[PDB]
Design a protein around this ligand. Structure first.
Ligand SMILES: Cc1cc2nc3c(=O)[nH]c(=O)nc-3n(C[C@H](O)[C@H](O)[C@H](O)COP(=O)(O)OP(=O)(O)OC[C@H]3O[C@@H](n4cnc5c(N)ncnc54)[C@H](O)[C@@H]3O)c2cc1C
Ligand SMILES: O=c1nc2n(C[C@H](O)[C@H](O)[C@H](O)CO)c3cc(O)ccc3cc-2c(=O)[nH]1
Length: 502
DNA sequence: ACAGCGGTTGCAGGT
DNA sequence: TACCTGCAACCGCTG
């Protein structure tokens, strides 16, 4: 018959390096038998208005919550998956559980800002102590903004100068095994259903299981650490890691693929940073930022900082960084790009892997992002943002929007002369086109001399490869060698228009 | 002041 | 091999 401490999961679905969670566990064990602990995850049915979520990411979260519960079970506790909106949920669970303190990890995203504010205001009303922690990113965006005179650095090299003169926080371990902690007595919901706050099953979470692809990347903290240690095994590979040197179209990932685990917070970026630093010190010949592996982690930190200031970071209108470009509507060309039926086998192969597996390589994301926007189709990056938002396992509001602005040359990147060739780009790393053959099996019998460009081969040859254009594989919707030059001139025109105002 | 430099990852043609 | 200059040219940051 006592008060309750609460940790609230949103991002940071881990035990390791969770100062918000450890602060609960250390305090509860400081006064044993005086508290109840409720590690909660609010299954908010309001994020659906905020973001598109595909089947693949729902599977990831299902596996994450299942692992988080298993990890919490070993600490004499458990997870509580509460259904309903926080604005409705909190008032009830504050009184019924009798909550004294509530902790959670901070998030810059607009949905959280309005949510975290409304929660903390109500906490002040109900006499609930709230102390938040900043552990999703290595550096606090506000402090970076502050030390750069109340504004965010709009270049990478300037950003590096601001962050290097800041203290790197202590990476924490796993919280203590709860001493003298019985199961909290069943509330109004738990009495009416014992399994009310249990982990949502696949059926409960994934509404359309036919959209699910192969489960190549299982969710959870356990897999995150496991995959990290596997990636850090070859220290030679880690040290000399240079991003442009990595292939976009290799069958098995040329990079670590820790981004989904960093997005959900199954892996601590601080720990990953700390682990990388240690290897660097044991390796003489090592790569330096931005191309380095730590540099890649710094890019995450970079996009998180600029987005912290601008709430309209995901849209063109009202965005302080985004170049105002008259993008054209074309639902026909949009539907084709979204489902990988453009007629460009390299672009289609990437988009099909994105739909099926839920992850694609950085330079593979580059090729498609350029093609849709300033490259060929001249379609707004906001459209491709939603496609990525739905299909990506690592869908990060800040990272998704920022990198889309990079490739559309709306912000940060400005050299619109550098346009990716959907025909040539893939050839360098994959001359045979194995990647195309796997994800576009229609063209698997085509020779390497015209697999990136089927329109080059005669009809009599098309029949001989068991794939005729127009039926078995769509005609190329636009002509790259023509459209990209016209788009270059369009980019220069809009670059003047924005320059005029300033 | 305007002007040189650097900018995660262009392409084609060349050595 | 890994880097050579054309292409006609952007932005922010620097002194
Ligand atoms: C149009 C577009 C949209 C993108 N959307 C997302 C997204 O929503 N979420 C996301 O995590 N990444 C996004 N990326 C960035 C990048 O493609 C991925 O982070 C990377 O390919 C994931 O593979 P990895 O984990 O092996 O990265 P690694 O090469 O292993 O890099 C290490 C870590 O650094 C981070 N990182 C790498 N590249 C970037 C970068 N370009 N910007 C910011 N952080 C980076 C990732 O979290 C990654 O886990 C996007 C890129 C483009 C071009
Ligand atoms: O608080 C929650 N946040 C959820 N978010 C997590 C989200 O990243 C954080 O809540 C952010 O802090 C919101 O801006 C999700 C994100 C996804 O990409 C996919 C599914 C979810 C589900 C939830 C959820 O149920 N509850």
């Amino acid at each position: 018959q006592r008060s309750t401490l609460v940790h609230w999961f949103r991002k940071g679905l881990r035990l390791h390096d969770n100062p918000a969670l450890s602060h609960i566990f250390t305090a509860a064990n400081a006064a044993p038998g005086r508290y109840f602990v409720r590690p909660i995850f609010i299954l908010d049915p309001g994020i659906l208005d905020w973001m598109q979520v595909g089947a693949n990411r729902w599977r990831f979260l299902q596996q994450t919550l299942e692992d988080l519960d298993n990890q919490l079970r070993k600490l004499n506790s458990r997870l509580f998956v509460v259904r309903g909106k926080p604005a409705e949920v909190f008032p009830r669970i504050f009184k019924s559980w009798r909550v004294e303190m509530l902790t959670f990890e901070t998030d810059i995203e607009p949905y959280s800002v309005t949510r975290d504010a409304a929660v903390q205001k109500l906490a002040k009303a109900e006499g609930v102590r709230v102390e938040t922690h900043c552990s999703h990113t290595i550096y606090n965006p506000e402090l970076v903004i502050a030390k750069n005179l109340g504004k965010a650095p709009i270049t990478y090299q300037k950003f590096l100068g601001i962050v290097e003169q800041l203290k790197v926080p202590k990476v924490l371990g796993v919280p203590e095994k709860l001493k003298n902690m019985p199961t909290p007595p069943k509330d109004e919901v738990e009495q009416k259903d014992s399994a009310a706050y249990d982990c949502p099953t696949m059926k409960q979470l994934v509404k359309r299981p036919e959209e699910l692809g192969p489960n190549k990347f299982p969710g959870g903290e356990t897999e995150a650490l496991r995959r990290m240690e596997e990636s850090l095994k070859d220290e030679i590979w880690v040290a000399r890691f240079e991003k442009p040197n990595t292939a976009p179209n290799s069958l098995e990932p040329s990079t670590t693929v820790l981004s989904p685990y960093l997005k959900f917070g199954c892996l601590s970026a601080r720990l990953f940073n700390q682990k990388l630093k240690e290897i660097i010190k044991r390796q003489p010949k090592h790569s330096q930022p931005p191309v380095s592996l730590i540099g890649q982690l710094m890019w995450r930190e970079f996009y998180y900082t600029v987005a912290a200031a601008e709430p309209n970071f995901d849209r063109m209108l009202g965005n302080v960084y985004c170049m105002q470009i008259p993008w054209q509507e074309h639902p026909d060309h949009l539907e084709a790009w979204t489902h990988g039926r453009t007629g460009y086998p390299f672009i289609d192969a990437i988009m099909r892997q994105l739909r099926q597996e839920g992850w694609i390589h950085n330079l593979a994301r580059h090729a498609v992002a350029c093609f849709l926007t300033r490259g060929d189709l001249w379609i707004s990056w906001e459209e491709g943002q939603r496609v990525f938002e739905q299909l990506l396992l690592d869908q990060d509001w800040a990272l998704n929007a920022g990198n889309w602005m990079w490739l559309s040359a709306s912000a940060f990147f400005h050299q619109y002369f550098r346009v990716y060739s959907p025909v040539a780009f893939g050839k360098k790393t994959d001359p045979q086109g194995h990647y195309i053959r796997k994800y576009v099996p229609e063209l698997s019998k085509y020779p390497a001399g015209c697999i990136y460009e089927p329109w080059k081969a005669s009809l009599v040859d098309q029949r001989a490869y068991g794939c005729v254009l127009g039926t078995d594989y769509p005609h190329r919707i636009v002509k790259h060698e023509v459209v990209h030059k016209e788009n270059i001139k369009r980019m220069g025109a809009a670059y003047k228009v924005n320059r005029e105002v300033r």
